[PDB]
mmCIF file of C-alpha atoms in Angstrom:
data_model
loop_
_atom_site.group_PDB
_atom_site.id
_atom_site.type_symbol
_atom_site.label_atom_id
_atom_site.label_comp_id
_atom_site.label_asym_id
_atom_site.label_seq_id
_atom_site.Cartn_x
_atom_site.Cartn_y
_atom_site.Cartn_z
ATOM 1 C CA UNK A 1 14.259 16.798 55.450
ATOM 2 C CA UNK A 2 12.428 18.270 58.312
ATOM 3 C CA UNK A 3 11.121 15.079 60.578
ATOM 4 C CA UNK A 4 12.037 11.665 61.129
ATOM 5 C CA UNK A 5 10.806 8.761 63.796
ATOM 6 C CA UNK A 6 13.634 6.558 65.005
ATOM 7 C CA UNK A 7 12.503 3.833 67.880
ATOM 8 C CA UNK A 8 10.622 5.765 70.464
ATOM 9 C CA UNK A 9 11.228 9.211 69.568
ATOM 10 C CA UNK A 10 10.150 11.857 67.035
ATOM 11 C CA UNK A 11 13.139 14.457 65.386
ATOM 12 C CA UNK A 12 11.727 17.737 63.962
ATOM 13 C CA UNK A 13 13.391 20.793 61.890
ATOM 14 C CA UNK A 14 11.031 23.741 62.817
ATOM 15 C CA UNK A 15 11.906 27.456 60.995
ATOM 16 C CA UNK A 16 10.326 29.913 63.886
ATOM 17 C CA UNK A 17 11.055 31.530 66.968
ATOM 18 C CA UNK A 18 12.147 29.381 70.270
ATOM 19 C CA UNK A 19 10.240 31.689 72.591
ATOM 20 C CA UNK A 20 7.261 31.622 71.076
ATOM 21 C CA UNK A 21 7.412 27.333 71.587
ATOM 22 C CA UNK A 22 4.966 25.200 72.710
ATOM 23 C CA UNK A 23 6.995 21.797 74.678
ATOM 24 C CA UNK A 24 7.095 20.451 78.085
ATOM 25 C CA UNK A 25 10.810 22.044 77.883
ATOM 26 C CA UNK A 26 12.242 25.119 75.875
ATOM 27 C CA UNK A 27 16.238 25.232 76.002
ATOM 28 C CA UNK A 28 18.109 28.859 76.624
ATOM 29 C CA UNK A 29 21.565 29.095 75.906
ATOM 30 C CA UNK A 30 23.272 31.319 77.793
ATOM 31 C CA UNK A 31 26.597 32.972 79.150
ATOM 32 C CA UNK A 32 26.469 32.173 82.896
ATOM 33 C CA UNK A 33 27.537 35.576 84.006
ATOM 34 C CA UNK A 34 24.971 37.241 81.608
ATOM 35 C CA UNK A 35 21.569 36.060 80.315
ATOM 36 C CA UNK A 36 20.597 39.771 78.687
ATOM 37 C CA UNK A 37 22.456 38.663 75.124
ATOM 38 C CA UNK A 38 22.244 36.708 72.335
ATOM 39 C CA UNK A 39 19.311 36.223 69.794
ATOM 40 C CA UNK A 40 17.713 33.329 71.786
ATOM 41 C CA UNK A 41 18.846 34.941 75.167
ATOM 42 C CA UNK A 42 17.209 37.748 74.568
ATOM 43 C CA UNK A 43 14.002 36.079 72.788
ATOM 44 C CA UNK A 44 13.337 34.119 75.545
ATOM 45 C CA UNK A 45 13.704 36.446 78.555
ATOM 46 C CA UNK A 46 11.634 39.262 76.659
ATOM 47 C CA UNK A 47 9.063 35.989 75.954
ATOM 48 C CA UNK A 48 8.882 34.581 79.693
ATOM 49 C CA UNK A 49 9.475 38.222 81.791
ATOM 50 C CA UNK A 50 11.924 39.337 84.438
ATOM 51 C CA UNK A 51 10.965 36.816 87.049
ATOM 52 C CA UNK A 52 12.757 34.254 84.828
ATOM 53 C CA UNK A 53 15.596 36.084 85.163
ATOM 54 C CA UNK A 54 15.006 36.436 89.675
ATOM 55 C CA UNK A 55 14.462 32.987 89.394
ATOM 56 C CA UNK A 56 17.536 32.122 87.194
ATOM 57 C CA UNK A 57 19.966 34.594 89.574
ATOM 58 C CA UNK A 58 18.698 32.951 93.402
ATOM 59 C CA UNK A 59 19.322 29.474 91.439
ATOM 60 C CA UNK A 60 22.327 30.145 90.200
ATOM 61 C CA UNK A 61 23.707 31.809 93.651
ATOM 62 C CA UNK A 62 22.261 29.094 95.402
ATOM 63 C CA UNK A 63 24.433 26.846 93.093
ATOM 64 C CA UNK A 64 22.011 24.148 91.380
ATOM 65 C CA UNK A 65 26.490 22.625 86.023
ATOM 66 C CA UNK A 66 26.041 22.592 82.594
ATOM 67 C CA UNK A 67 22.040 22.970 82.333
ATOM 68 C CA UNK A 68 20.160 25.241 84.689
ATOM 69 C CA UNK A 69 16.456 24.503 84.990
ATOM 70 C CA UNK A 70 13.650 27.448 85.533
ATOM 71 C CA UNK A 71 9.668 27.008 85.403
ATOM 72 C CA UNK A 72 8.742 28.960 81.876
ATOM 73 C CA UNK A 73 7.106 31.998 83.456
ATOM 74 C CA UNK A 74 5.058 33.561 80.147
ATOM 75 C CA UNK A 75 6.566 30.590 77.901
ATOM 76 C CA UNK A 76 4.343 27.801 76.865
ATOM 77 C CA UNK A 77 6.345 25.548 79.241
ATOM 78 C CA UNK A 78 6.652 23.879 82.298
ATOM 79 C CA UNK A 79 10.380 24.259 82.601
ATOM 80 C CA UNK A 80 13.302 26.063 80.732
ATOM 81 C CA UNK A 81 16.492 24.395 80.684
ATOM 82 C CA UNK A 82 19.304 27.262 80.502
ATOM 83 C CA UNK A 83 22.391 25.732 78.447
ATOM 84 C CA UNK A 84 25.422 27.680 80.744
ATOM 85 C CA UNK A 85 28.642 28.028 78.118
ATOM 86 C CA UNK A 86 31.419 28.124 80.506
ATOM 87 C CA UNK A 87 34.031 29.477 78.666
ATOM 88 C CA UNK A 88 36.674 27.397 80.666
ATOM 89 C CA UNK A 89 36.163 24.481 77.991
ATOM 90 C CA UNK A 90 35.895 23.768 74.053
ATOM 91 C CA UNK A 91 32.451 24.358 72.382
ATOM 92 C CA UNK A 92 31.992 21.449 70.766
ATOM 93 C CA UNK A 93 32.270 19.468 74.589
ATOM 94 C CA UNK A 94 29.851 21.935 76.153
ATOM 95 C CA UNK A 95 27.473 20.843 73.392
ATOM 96 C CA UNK A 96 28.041 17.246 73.963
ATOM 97 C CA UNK A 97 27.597 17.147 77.315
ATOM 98 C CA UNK A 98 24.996 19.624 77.539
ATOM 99 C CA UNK A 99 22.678 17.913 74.906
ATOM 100 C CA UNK A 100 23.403 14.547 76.767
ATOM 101 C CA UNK A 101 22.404 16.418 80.114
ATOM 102 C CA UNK A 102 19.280 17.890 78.591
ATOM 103 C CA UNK A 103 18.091 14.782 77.495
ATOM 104 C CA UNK A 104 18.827 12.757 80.674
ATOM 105 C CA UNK A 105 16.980 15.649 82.778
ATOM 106 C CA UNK A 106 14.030 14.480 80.051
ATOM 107 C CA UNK A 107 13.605 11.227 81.703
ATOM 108 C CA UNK A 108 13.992 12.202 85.159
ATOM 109 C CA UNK A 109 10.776 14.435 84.574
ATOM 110 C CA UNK A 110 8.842 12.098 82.726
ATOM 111 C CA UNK A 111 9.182 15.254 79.677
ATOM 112 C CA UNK A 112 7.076 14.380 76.604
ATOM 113 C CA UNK A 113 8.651 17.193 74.151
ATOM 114 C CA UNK A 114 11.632 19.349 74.131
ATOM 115 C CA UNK A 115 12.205 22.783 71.971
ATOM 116 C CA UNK A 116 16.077 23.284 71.154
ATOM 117 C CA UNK A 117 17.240 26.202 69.123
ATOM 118 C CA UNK A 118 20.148 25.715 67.120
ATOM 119 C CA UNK A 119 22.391 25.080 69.698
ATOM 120 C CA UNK A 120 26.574 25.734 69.244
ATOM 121 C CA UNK A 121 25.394 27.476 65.721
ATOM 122 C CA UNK A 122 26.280 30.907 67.467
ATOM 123 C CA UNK A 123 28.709 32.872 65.621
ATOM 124 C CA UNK A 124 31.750 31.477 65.106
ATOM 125 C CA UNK A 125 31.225 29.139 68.058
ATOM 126 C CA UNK A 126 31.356 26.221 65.838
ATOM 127 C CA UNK A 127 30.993 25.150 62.354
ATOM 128 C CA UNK A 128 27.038 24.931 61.504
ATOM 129 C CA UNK A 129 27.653 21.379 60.204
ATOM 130 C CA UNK A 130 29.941 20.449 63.182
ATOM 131 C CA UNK A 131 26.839 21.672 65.658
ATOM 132 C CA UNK A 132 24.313 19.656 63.766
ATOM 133 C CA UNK A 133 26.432 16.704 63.674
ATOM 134 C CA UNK A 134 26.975 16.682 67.154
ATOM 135 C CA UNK A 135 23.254 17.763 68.250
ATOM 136 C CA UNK A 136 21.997 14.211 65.809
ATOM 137 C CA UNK A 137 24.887 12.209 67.130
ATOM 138 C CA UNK A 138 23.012 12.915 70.933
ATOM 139 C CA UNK A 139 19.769 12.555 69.699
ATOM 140 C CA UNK A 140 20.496 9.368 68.036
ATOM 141 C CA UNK A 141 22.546 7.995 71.046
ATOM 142 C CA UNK A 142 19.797 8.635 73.432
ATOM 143 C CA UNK A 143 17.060 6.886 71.406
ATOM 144 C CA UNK A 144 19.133 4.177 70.905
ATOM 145 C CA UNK A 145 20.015 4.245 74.988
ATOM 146 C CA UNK A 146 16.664 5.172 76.728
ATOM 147 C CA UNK A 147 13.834 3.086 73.736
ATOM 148 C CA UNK A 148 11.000 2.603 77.051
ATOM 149 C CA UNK A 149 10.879 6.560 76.634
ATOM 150 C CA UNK A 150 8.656 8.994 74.072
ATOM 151 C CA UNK A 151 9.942 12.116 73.374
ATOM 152 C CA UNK A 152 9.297 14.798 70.654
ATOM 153 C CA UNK A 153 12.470 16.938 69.832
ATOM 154 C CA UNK A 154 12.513 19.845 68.250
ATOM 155 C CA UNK A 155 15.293 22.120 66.517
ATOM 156 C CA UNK A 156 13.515 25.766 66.084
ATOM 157 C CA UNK A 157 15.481 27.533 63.780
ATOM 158 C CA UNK A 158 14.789 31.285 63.024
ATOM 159 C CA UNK A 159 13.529 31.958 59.821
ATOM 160 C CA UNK A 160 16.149 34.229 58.549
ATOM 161 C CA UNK A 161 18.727 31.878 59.350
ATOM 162 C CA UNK A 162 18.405 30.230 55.477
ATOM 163 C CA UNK A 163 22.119 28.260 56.250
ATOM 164 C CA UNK A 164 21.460 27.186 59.472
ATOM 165 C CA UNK A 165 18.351 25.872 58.334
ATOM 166 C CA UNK A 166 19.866 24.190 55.153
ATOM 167 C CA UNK A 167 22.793 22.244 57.440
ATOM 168 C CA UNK A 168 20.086 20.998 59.794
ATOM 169 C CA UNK A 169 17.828 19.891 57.068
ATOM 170 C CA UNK A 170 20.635 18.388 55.254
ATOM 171 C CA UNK A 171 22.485 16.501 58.066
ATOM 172 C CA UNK A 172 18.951 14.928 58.882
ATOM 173 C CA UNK A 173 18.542 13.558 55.315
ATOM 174 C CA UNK A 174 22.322 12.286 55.903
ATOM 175 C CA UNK A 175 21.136 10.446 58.898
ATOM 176 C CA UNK A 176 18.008 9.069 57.317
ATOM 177 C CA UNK A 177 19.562 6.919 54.260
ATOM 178 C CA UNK A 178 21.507 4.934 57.156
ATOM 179 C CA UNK A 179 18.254 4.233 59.146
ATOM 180 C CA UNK A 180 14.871 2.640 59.078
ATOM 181 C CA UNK A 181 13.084 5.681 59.813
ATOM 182 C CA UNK A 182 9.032 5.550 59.932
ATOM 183 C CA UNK A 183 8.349 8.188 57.111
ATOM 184 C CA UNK A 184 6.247 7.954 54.326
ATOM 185 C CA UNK A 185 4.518 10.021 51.188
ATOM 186 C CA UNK A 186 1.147 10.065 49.903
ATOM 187 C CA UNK B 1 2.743 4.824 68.011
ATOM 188 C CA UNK B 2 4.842 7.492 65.875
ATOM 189 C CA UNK B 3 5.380 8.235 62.003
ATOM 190 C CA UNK B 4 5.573 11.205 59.228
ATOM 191 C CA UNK B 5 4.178 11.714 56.574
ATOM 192 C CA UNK B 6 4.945 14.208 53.705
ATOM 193 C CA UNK B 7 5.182 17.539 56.505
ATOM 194 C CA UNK B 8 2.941 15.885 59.112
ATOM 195 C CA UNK B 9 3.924 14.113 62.260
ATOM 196 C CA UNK B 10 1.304 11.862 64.191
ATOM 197 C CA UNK B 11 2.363 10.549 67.567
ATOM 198 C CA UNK B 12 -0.136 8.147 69.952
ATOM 199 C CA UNK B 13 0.164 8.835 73.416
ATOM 200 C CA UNK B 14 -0.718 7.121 76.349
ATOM 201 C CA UNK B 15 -1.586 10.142 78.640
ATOM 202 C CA UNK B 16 -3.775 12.758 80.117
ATOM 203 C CA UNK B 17 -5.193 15.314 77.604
ATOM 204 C CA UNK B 18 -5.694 17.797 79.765
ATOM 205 C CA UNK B 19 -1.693 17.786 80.377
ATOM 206 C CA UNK B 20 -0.825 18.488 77.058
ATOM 207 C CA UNK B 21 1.703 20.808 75.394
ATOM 208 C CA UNK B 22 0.726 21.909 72.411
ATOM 209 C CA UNK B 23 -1.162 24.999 70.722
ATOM 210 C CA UNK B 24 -4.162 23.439 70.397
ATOM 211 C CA UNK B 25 -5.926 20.967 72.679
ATOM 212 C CA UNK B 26 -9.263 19.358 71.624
ATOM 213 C CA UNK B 27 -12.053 19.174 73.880
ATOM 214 C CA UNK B 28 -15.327 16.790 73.210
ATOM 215 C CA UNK B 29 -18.619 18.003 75.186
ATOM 216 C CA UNK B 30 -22.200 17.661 75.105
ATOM 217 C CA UNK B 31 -23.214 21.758 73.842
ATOM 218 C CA UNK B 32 -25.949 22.167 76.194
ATOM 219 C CA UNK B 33 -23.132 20.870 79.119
ATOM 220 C CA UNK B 34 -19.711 20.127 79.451
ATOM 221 C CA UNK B 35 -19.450 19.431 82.973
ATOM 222 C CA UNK B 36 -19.971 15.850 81.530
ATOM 223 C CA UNK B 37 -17.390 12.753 80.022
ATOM 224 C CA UNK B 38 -13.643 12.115 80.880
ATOM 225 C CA UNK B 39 -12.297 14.336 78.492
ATOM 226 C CA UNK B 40 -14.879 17.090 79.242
ATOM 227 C CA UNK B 41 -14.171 16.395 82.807
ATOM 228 C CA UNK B 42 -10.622 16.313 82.497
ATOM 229 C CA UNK B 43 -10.043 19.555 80.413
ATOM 230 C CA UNK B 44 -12.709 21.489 82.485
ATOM 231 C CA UNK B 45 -10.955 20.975 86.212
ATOM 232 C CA UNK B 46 -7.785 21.873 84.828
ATOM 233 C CA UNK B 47 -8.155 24.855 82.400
ATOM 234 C CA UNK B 48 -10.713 25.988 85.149
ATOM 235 C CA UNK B 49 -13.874 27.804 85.554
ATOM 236 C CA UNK B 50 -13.215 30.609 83.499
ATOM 237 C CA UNK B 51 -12.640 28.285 80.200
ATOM 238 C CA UNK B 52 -16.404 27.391 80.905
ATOM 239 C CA UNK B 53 -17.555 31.296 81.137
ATOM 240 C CA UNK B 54 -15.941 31.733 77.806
ATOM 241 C CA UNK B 55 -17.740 28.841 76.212
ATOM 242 C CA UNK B 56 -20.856 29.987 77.045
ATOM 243 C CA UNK B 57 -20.232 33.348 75.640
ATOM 244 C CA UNK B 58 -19.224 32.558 72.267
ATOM 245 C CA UNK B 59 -22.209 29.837 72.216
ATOM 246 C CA UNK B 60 -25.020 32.114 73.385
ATOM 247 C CA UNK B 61 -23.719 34.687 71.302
ATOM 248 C CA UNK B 62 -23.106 32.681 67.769
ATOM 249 C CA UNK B 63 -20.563 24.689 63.763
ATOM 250 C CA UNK B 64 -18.938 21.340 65.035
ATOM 251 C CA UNK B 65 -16.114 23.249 66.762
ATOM 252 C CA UNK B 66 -16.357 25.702 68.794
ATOM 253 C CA UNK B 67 -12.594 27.638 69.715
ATOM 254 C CA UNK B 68 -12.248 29.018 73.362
ATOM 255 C CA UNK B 69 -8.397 30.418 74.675
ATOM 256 C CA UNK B 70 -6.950 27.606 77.024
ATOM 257 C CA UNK B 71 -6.603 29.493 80.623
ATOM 258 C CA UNK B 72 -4.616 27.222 82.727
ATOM 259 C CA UNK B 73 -3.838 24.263 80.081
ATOM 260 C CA UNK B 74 -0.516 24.415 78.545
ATOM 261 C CA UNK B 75 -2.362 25.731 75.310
ATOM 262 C CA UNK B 76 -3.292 28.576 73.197
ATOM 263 C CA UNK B 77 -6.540 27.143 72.043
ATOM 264 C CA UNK B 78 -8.890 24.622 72.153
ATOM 265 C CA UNK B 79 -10.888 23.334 70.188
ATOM 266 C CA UNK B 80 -14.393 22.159 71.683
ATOM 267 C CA UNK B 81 -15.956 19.576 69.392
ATOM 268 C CA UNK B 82 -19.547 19.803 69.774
ATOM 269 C CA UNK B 83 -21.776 16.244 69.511
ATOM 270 C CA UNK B 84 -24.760 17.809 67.957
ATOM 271 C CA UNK B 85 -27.175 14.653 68.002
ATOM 272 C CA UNK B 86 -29.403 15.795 65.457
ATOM 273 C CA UNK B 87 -26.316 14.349 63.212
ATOM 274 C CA UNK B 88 -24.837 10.629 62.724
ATOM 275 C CA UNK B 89 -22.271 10.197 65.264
ATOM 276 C CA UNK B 90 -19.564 8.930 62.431
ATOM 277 C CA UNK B 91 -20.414 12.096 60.699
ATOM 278 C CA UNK B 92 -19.568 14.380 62.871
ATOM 279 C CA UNK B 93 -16.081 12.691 63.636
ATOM 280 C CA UNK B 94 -15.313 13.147 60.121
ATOM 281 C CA UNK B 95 -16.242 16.263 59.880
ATOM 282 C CA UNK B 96 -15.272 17.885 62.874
ATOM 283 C CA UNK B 97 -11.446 16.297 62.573
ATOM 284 C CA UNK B 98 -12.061 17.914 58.931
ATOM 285 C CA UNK B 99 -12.841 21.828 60.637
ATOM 286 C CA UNK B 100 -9.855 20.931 63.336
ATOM 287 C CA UNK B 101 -7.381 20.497 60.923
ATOM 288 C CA UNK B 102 -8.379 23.308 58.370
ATOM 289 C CA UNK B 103 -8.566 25.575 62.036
ATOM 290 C CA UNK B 104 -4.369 24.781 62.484
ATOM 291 C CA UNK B 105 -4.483 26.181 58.788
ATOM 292 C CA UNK B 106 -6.619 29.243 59.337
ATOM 293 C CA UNK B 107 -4.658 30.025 63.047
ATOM 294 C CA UNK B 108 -1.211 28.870 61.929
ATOM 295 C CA UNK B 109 -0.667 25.862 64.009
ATOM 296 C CA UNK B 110 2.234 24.063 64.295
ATOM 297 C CA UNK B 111 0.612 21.053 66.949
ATOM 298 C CA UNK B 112 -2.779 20.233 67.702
ATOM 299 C CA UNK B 113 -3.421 17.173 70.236
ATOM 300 C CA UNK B 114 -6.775 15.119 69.825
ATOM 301 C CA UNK B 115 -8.514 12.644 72.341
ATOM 302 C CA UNK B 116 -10.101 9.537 70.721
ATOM 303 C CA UNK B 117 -13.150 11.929 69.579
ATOM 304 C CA UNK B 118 -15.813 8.974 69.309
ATOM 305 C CA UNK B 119 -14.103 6.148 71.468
ATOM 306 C CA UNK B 120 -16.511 7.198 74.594
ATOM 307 C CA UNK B 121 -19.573 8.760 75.048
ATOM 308 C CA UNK B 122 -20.740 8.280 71.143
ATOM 309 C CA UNK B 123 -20.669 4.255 71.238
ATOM 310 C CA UNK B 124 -18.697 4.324 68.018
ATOM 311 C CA UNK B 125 -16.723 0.897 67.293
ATOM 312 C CA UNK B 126 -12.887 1.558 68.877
ATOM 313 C CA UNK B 127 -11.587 0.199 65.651
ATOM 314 C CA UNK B 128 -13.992 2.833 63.361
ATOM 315 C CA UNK B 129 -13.110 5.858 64.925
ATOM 316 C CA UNK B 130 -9.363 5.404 64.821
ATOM 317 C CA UNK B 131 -10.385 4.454 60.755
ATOM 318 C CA UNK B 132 -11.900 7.944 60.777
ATOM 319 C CA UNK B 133 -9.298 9.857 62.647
ATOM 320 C CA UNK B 134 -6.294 8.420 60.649
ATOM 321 C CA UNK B 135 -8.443 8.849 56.896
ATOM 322 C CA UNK B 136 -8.654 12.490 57.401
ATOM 323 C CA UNK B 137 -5.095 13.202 59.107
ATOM 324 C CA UNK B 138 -2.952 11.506 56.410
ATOM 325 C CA UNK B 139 -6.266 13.517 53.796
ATOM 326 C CA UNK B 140 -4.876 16.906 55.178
ATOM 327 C CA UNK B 141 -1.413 15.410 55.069
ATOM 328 C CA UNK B 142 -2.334 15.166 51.536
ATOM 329 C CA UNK B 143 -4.062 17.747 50.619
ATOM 330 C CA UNK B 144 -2.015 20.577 52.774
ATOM 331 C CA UNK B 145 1.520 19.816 52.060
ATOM 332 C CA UNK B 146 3.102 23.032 53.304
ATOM 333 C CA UNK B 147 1.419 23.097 56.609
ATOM 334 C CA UNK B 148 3.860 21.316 59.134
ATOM 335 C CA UNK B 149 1.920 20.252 62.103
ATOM 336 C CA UNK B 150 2.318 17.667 64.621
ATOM 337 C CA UNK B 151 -0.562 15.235 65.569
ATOM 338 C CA UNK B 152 -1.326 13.744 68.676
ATOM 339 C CA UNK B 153 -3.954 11.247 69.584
ATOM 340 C CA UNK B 154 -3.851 11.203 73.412
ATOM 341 C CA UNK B 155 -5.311 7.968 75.033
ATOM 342 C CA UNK B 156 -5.937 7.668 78.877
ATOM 343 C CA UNK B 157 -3.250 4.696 80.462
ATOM 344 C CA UNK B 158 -6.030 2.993 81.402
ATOM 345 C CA UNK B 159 -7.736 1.858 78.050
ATOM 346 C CA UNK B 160 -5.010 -0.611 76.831
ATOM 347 C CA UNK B 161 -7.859 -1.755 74.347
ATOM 348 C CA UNK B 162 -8.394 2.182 72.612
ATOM 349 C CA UNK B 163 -4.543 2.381 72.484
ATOM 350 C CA UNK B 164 -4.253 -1.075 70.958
ATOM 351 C CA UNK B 165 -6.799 -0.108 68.043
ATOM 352 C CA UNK B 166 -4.986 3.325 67.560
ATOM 353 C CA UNK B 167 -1.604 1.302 67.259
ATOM 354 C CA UNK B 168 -3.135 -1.547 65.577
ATOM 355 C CA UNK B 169 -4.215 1.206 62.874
ATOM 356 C CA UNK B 170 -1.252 3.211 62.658
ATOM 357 C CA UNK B 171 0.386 0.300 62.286
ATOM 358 C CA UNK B 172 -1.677 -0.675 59.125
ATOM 359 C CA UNK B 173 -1.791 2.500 57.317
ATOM 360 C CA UNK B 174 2.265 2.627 57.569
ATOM 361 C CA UNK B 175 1.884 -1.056 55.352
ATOM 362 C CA UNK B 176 0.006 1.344 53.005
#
């Protein structure tokens, strides 16, 4: 209920704070217009400093889009990718598309491990089931799709956030009784 | 190369240590002078200079692991196992992945990555220290439950023959 190994990659469920990660690549989400708000928004520019933000704002205007990328200033990262919610299309596509986009931009930097916060979970974004169903059904799909390449993923939940926690955890053990899975007990 | 157990992961890696991400990083140096072995080498050149000012402070000043911050590696720590020789070479593999691991405890750690401690410099059969290394990993496993941490044993691309004992061994401790 909190890891599993599937082919060539490693799932985690982590309670603690995104910002404070450790990966090759820690994932923002953010409104395009605004990167000041939200929990993880917030977490993550207070975490890396304001030249995250320069940085995100001469990218942006130079028009680099779903996922933004940034170095990690003051994270433990090389890169951040910023997950932009355009508001022009459903929530549960953005997701899709962004998590596929994500981990494509893995393999095209040779990334190792990526730190996700609960993506989609927001608040009333989308159904906290529907979010991890989606973020596993990506996961999944690109282990399945891309087997020549190693990559740790991890879903950093904060620690208040018992029912987030509890439909991650749970939609993992879902996914587990329908696959091999290298884990064991001792 | 990966699998869990109980709240542990433990991944091998083909890589370079020294290009980690993780909290912890583990070093392995002669005490008197780490200037010396791949790893040593490796860690030294990119952490930098100032990782090597550090060590010497908290040596002269005062153990099979000695802890230093991780300047310019993508860590907060690292862990320098020492190779006292006044001590069997097997020994101090055990015991020194035994102080690691109880470290991650004491510092709340969350993902430590380990060379082969013992594959190099310290003669040690390939196949024996990956024995070591995996008895104490799935011990803690074990014997700390509630810790989650994440394992790495990071091997350089080049030794196809380390990495095939570390897989080879991974491999048999899943059968158990």
């Amino acid at each position: 209920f909190n890891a599993m190994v599937v082919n060539n990659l490693t799932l985690q469920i982590v309670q603690g704070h995104i910002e404070w990660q450790t990966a090759d690549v820690i994932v923002n989400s953010v409104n395009p217009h605004d990167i000041t708000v939200g929990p993880v928004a917030k977490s993550i520019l207070q975490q890396a400093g304001v030249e995250m933000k320069s940085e995100f704002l001469a990218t942006k205007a130079k028009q680099f889009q779903l996922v933004l990328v940034t170095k990690g200033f003051n994270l433990f990262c090389k890169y951040i990718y910023h997950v932009l919610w355009h508001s022009e299309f459903p929530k549960p596509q953005i997701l899709k598309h962004a998590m596929k986009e994500c981990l494509e931009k893995c393999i095209e930097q040779n990334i190792t491990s990526i730190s996700f916060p609960a993506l989609g979970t927001g608040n009333m974004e989308i159904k906290k089931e529907t979010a991890a169903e989606i973020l596993f059904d990506e996961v999944l799909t690109f282990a399945k799709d891309h087997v020549k390449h190693q990559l740790t993923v991890k879903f950093v939940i904060f620690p208040t956030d018992l029912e987030i926690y509890k439909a991650f955890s749970s939609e993992m053990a879902k996914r587990s009784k329908m696959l091999s899975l290298n884990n064991y007990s001792v």
